[PDB]
C-alpha cells in the first residue's frame, strides 16, 4: 500500500531467490588461487613474458568511444605478410594471430 508520496518500485523478488542466492565468501580464496596459478605459470615459462603473447593496436567500434585504443585479439594475416612473418611461426615466437580480422584503413 502506497503512503504519502513514495517512489513506485517493483522489486524482482517473486521467485525462489533465497535458493539461488550466490554468496561471495570465497572471493579472497579465489583471488589467492588465481595469484598462485599465475605465479606457477610464470615459473613454468621462465624466460617468456608473464602476460603472454603480444597484442595488436586496435580501435573501438560503437562511436560512443570511437577514440580509445585497446589491445586486439591478434595480429592480422595481412599485417604479418607485410612484416614478413609467417603466421604459423608467429604462434611459436609469441605473436597473437587471428584469421578473422580485416584491414580497411
Amino acid at each position: 500500500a502506497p503512503s504519502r508520496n513514495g517512489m513506485i518500485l517493483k522489486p524482482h523478488f517473486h521467485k525462489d531467490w533465497q535458493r539461488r542466492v550466490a554468496t561471495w565468501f570465497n572471493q579472497p580464496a579465489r583471488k589467492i588461487r588465481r595469484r598462485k596459478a599465475r605465479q606457477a605459470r610464470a615459473r613454468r615459462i621462465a624466460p617468456r613474458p608473464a602476460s603472454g603473447p603480444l597484442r595488436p593496436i586496435v580501435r573501438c567500434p560503437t562511436v560512443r568511444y570511437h577514440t580509445k585504443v585497446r589491445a586486439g585479439r591478434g595480429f592480422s594475416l595481412e599485417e604479418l605478410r607485410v612484416a614478413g612473418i609467417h603466421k604459423k611461426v608467429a604462434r611459436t615466437i609469441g605473436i597473437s594471430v587471428d584469421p578473422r580480422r580485416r584491414n580497411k584503413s
Partner: protein, 187 residues
C-alpha cells in the same frame, strides 16, 4: 485547575551540536562564552549556526562569496561563513579576500592564497575581532539541494511544478494519463 495547552510548551531549537568531534565542541565553548559575555549579536548568530546540522549550513561557492564581497560598502571586511568554502571553476578573476570558515576545499584554498588573500579559522577570528567588527556574514543556498525540488504541492495538482519520485525518467514511465491532454486529463 488551569487551562494551558502543553502542546508546544517545549521548544525544539538545538542547544548543543549532535556531532561528537572535539574541535567543533571547543569552538562551541568559545563562542558560548563570547555570546554570553559580549553584547554583540554576531557571536550569538555564529553560535546558533555552529549548532546547526550539515544540511542547515550548505557550502558556499567561491563565485557567490566574490559577488557578495563585491557589493559597495564591504571593502576590507572579513567574510564569515559557518559552512565550507568550495572552489568555483567557472570564475577566473579572483580578488584577494579575508575568509573565515570551518573548512575550505583544497582548490579554493589554493585560489585564495594565490590571489593574495587570507584564510582564518574561528578561533583566529575571535582573537582578531571578538565582537565580529568588520565582518560580513555569508551562507550558502539553503534550498540548493535537489531534495527541496520534491517538496511543496504534490504532482498531479493544478499549478504544481514539483518533481515526482520516479525510478528513472523516460518515455514510458510518466507523461501519460494525468499529464497528457489526449489521455484522460492533465494538471
Amino acid at each position: 485547575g488551569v487551562d494551558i495547552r502543553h502542546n508546544k510548551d517545549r521548544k525544539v531549537r538545538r542547544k548543543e551540536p549532535k556531532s561528537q568531534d572535539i574541535y567543533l565542541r571547543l569552538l562551541v565553548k568559545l563562542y558560548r562564552f563570547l555570546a554570553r559575555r559580549t553584547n554583540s549579536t554576531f557571536n550569538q548568530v555564529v553560535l546558533k549556526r555552529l549548532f546547526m546540522s550539515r544540511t542547515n549550513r550548505p557550502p558556499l561557492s567561491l563565485s557567490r562569496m566574490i559577488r557578495k564581497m563585491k557589493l559597495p560598502g564591504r571593502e576590507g571586511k572579513t567574510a564569515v561563513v559557518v559552512g565550507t568554502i568550495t572552489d568555483d571553476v567557472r570564475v577566473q578573476e579572483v580578488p584577494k579576500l579575508k575568509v573565515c570558515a570551518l573548512r575550505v576545499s583544497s582548490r579554493a584554498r589554493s585560489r585564495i592564497l594565490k590571489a593574495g588573500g587570507k584564510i582564518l579559522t574561528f578561533d583566529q577570528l575571535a582573537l582578531d575581532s571578538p565582537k565580529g567588527c568588520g565582518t560580513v556574514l555569508l551562507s550558502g543556498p539553503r534550498k540548493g539541494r535537489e531534495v527541496y525540488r520534491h517538496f511543496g504541492k504534490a504532482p498531479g495538482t493544478p499549478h504544481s511544478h514539483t518533481k515526482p519520485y520516479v525510478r528513472s525518467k523516460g518515455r514510458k514511465f510518466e507523461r501519460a494519463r494525468g499529464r497528457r491532454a489526449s489521455r484522460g486529463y492533465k494538471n
